[PDB]
Amino acid sequence: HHWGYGKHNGPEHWHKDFPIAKGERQSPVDIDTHTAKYDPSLKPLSVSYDQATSLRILNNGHAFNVEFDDSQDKAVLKGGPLDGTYRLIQFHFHWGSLDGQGSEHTVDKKKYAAELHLVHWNTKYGDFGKAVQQPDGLAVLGIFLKVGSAKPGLQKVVDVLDSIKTKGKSADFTNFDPRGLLPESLDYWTYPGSLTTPPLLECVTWIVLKEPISVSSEQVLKFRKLNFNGEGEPEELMVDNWRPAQPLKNRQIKASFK
Ligand SMILES: CN1CCN(C(=O)c2ccc(S(N)(=O)=O)cc2)C[C@@H]1Cc1ccccc1
Numbered sequence: 001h002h003w004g005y006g007k008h009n010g011p012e013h014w015h016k017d018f019p020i021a022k023g024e025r026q027s028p029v030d031i032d033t034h035t036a037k038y039d040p041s042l043k044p045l046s047v048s049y050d051q052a053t054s055l056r057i058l059n060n061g062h063a064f065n066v067e068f069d070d071s072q073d074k075a076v077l078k079g080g081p082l083d084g085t086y087r088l089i090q091f092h093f094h095w096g097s098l099d100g101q102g103s104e105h106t107v108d109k110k111k112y113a114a115e116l117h118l119v120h121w122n123t124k125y126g127d128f129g130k131a132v133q134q135p136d137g138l139a140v141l142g143i144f145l146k147v148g149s150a151k152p153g154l155q156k157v158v159d160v161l162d163s164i165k166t167k168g169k170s171a172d173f174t175n176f177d178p179r180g181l182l183p184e185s186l187d188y189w190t191y192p193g194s195l196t197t198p199p200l201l202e203c204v205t206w207i208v209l210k211e212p213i214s215v216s217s218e219q220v221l222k223f224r225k226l227n228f229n230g231e232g233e234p235e236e237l238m239v240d241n242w243r244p245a246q247p248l249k250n251r252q253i254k255a256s257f258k
């Protein structure tokens with residue numbers, strides 16, 4: 001009876017195995033755009049993905065992860081609110097059963113069709129497993145997806161999903177360039193939070209881009225053909241793999257822009 005996104009094991013149940021679910025810096029949150037304060041001391045974000053080495057794509061039963069070689073400073077996130085150098089380890093998405101839901105963060109209570117999480121760890125902690133034990137261990141770059149025009153740099157991801165339909169399937173996924181998933185603007189909101197899945201560790205500096213990317217209805221439909229289940233198990237479509245907004249509590253969301 002493991003955690004997931006069903007009626008019996010979904011987000012309202014997680015606190016029983018992961019009591020930090022009710023903690024003081026849980027993610028995601030609603031971004032109230034009128035209350036977020038411009039912080040003119042925030043620096044521009046530095047996204048340095050030119051030497052990124054993608055390796056593999058994995059259906060983990062909760063989402064799919066595009067994994068990178070993080071054994072050197074190849075694809076890194078710096079600046080913005082961050083002190084030091086954060087290495088890209090993987091990206092994944094959260095999405096809905098319908099275009100009107102799927103994002104984890106909301107903006108003035110608006111839900112987007114999906115949300116991309118580019119996950120990075122602070123190199124001062126040496127490995128990802130050590131970093132998630134620290135309050136400044138991770139930086140997750142969050143990008144909203146809306147349905148409209150296709151995102152050409154997403155199609156190589158969409159086209160491999162048939163090969164990883166079920167939990168535990170992986171596929172080679174070399175030479176994928178995550179720069180093709182970014183919007184034009186790097187304007188962002190930032191706040192201290194958590195992993196949005198168990199173990200819900202309070203180790204993330206969230207950086208949420210204001211500008212969503214557009215994907216096509218056909219691209220997101222292909223996300224919704226994935227399976228939560230393993231091969232030869234009853235089919236349960238991988239949809240609505242998002243945690244809803246959690247209480248902001250004693251936190252301030254800062255804006256990089258006016
Ligand atoms: C390493 N795994 C397995 C997968 N996972 C994560 O690494 C992770 C990353 C990003 C997010 S998010 N949606 O961007 O906030 C959520 C979870 C969870 C988990 C983390 C973990 C940490 C310590 C002990 C055991 C497991």
Ligand SMILES: [Zn+2]
Nearest residue numbers: 092094117196
């Ligand atoms: Zn995520």
